[PDB]
Design a protein around this ligand. Structure first.
Ligand SMILES: COc1cc(Cl)cc(CNCCCNC(=O)Nc2ccccc2)c1
Length: 496
């Protein structure tokens, strides 16, 4: 019985087209999910779309179609993005689906049963100019006879009927969660902003609207529809068949990792665990927030220009996962050409071309390993353990850095050994250097699979590695057998 691993992306708002922020999140989470599959886990990987709300109703009114029709049309682009990005998601969740309507209504009833939902209103001062709420003390009536907020704009007393979740009851329980799980909300900078926020006191949370019907109705009060909080976050349990706990997929709960953007960190580390606690459900083991990408841009055009695995590699390598980063035409071209086309690509071509020409297209029979041979072989084995430990802390750049440090060293190894000169001098020793090179390329090939799957598959194909020997366990246990026929080598990473 393989151990279970549930991982998710935050669900995208399909109000516009797919931006690069959505692509980045999906790529990172896809790589993590693939990594765990290869590491032996029973993986479930989810992504999807948040389709309700006032902005979506208004967009639909503008184009002269129903909100559902619009939701269908715009979400197809996000489905197509997942396909073009080579996403290995086992399901695609859409908030408009019946299964989500039932699951959101179920968790709402569970929270009503726990005594955490009441009907009331959100009565206070609102600045229409600042688009924010204020307490009375932050305001001041001026000579106008008009009340102003703290930013010098008028405020107006807005009053709207709303259901509330009793978030004020979960302060001490959430603080206990953070003390008992240091890794619940990462990276470290996110945690501190969450702990500081919860310490300063939590007020009860508005969870329904009366201003639009494009939403999930509130049970026993259909004039209200559910606001974003209960709707969007419940997608993670909808995908496992909630509220049916007899479903085969329900064993995947709790989620091992919710991968999200930094902007929605509060909603996944404060509101979401409070809801789960109220509904008598276990909490996710980690929420990891990534940073944003700036242009120092449409993900379909980037993939077409630079290549998919080139983009996947760059985003995961150059930006430390958690921090903000940049991408430019110059940076993508340089770093992919250097690491993929030159370092990994040419090392495969030079070595495997020598096997095709000098060793009759067969893996050479290796003799004794020198101290140089051992070092590069052991460094490749050690990269897997550094990669495993890094991926537990969502440090994708550190995983790729360790794997491509082996590639860089293997190039220096191959060059120092001078196999070309050994062809005349000592053919048997040439065979050993070429064996060692191919063997390191196999180990690297297996290890890079989650990050660059199609290109990794090609490399392993030209090493004649069978389909059932491409797990991480095969790095130590399934080395290349001398005498095996290899197909004619072709370049895996063409230069830009
Ligand atoms: C609820 O916290 C979030 C959870 C996830 Cl998984 C993702 C996000 C980020 N999505 C963008 C938010 C904009 N969408 C929105 O407000 N939808 C909405 C509005 C009213 C009623 C139901 C959904 C926010």
């Amino acid at each position: 019985s393989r151990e279970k691993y549930y991982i998710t992306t935050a669900i995208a708002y399909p109000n516009g087209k797919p931006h690069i922020g959505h692509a980045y999140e999906l790529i990172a989470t896809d790589a993590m999910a693939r990594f765990q599959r290869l590491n032996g886990m029973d993986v479930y990987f989810l992504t999807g779309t948040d389709e309700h709300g006032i902005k979506m109703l208004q967009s639909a009114r503008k184009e002269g179609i129903t909100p559902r029709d619009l939701a269908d049309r715009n979400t197809s682009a996000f489905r197509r993005m997942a396909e073009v990005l080579n996403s290995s998601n086992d399901d695609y969740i859409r908030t408009s689906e019946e299964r989500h309507y039932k699951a959101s209504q179920a968790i709402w009833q569970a929270m009503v049963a726990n005594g955490d939902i009441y009907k009331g209103g959100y009565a206070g001062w609102y600045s229409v100019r600042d688009e924010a709420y204020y307490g009375e003390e932050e305001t001041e009536v001026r000579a106008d006879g008009v009340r102003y907020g703290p930013q010098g704009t008028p405020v107006e007393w807005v009053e709207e009927e709303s259901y509330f979740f009793r978030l004020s009851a979960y302060q001490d329980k959430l603080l206990d969660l953070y003390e008992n799980n240091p890794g619940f909300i990462m990276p470290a900078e996110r945690r501190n902003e969450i702990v500081s926020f919860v310490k300063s006191g939590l007020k009860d949370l508005s969870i329904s609207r009366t201003t639009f019907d494009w939403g999930i109705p509130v049970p026993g009060d259909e004039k209200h529809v559910m606001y974003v909080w209960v709707d969007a976050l419940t997608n993670y349990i909808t995908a496992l068949g909630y509220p049916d706990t007899t479903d085969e997929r329900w064993a995947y709960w709790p989620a091992n990792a919710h991968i999200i953007g930094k902007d929605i960190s509060r909603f996944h580390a404060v509101y979401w665990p409070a809801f789960l606690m109220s509904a008598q459900l276990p909490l996710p083991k980690r929420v990891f927030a990534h940073g944003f990408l700036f242009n120092r841009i449409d993900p379909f055009e980037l993939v077409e220009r630079y290549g998919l695995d080139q983009l996947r590699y760059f985003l995961m390598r150059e930006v430390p996962f958690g921090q903000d980063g940049s991408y430019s035409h110059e940076a993508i071209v340089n770093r992919t050409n250097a690491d993929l086309a030159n370092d990994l690509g040419n090392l495969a071509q030079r070595s495997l071309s020598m096997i095709a020409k000098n060793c009759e297209g067969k893996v050479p029979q290796p003799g004794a390993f020198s101290e140089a041979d051992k070092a590069i072989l052991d460094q490749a084995d050690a990269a897997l353990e550094t990669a495993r430990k890094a991926m537990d802390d969502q440090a994708l750049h550190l995983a790729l850095g360790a794997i491509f440090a082996v590639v860089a060293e293997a190039n220096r190894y191959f060059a120092g050994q001078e196999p070309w000169a050994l062809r005349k001098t000592d053919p048997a020793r040439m065979g050993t250097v070429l064996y060692v090179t191919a063997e390191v390329l196999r180990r690297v090939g297996i290890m890079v699979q989650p990050f660059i799957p199609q290109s990794a598959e090609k490399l392993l194909d030209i090493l004649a590695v069978p389909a059932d020997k491409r797990q991480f366990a095969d790095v130590l246990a399934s080395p290349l057998a001398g005498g095996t026929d290899l197909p004619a080598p072709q370049p895996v990473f063409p230069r830009y």
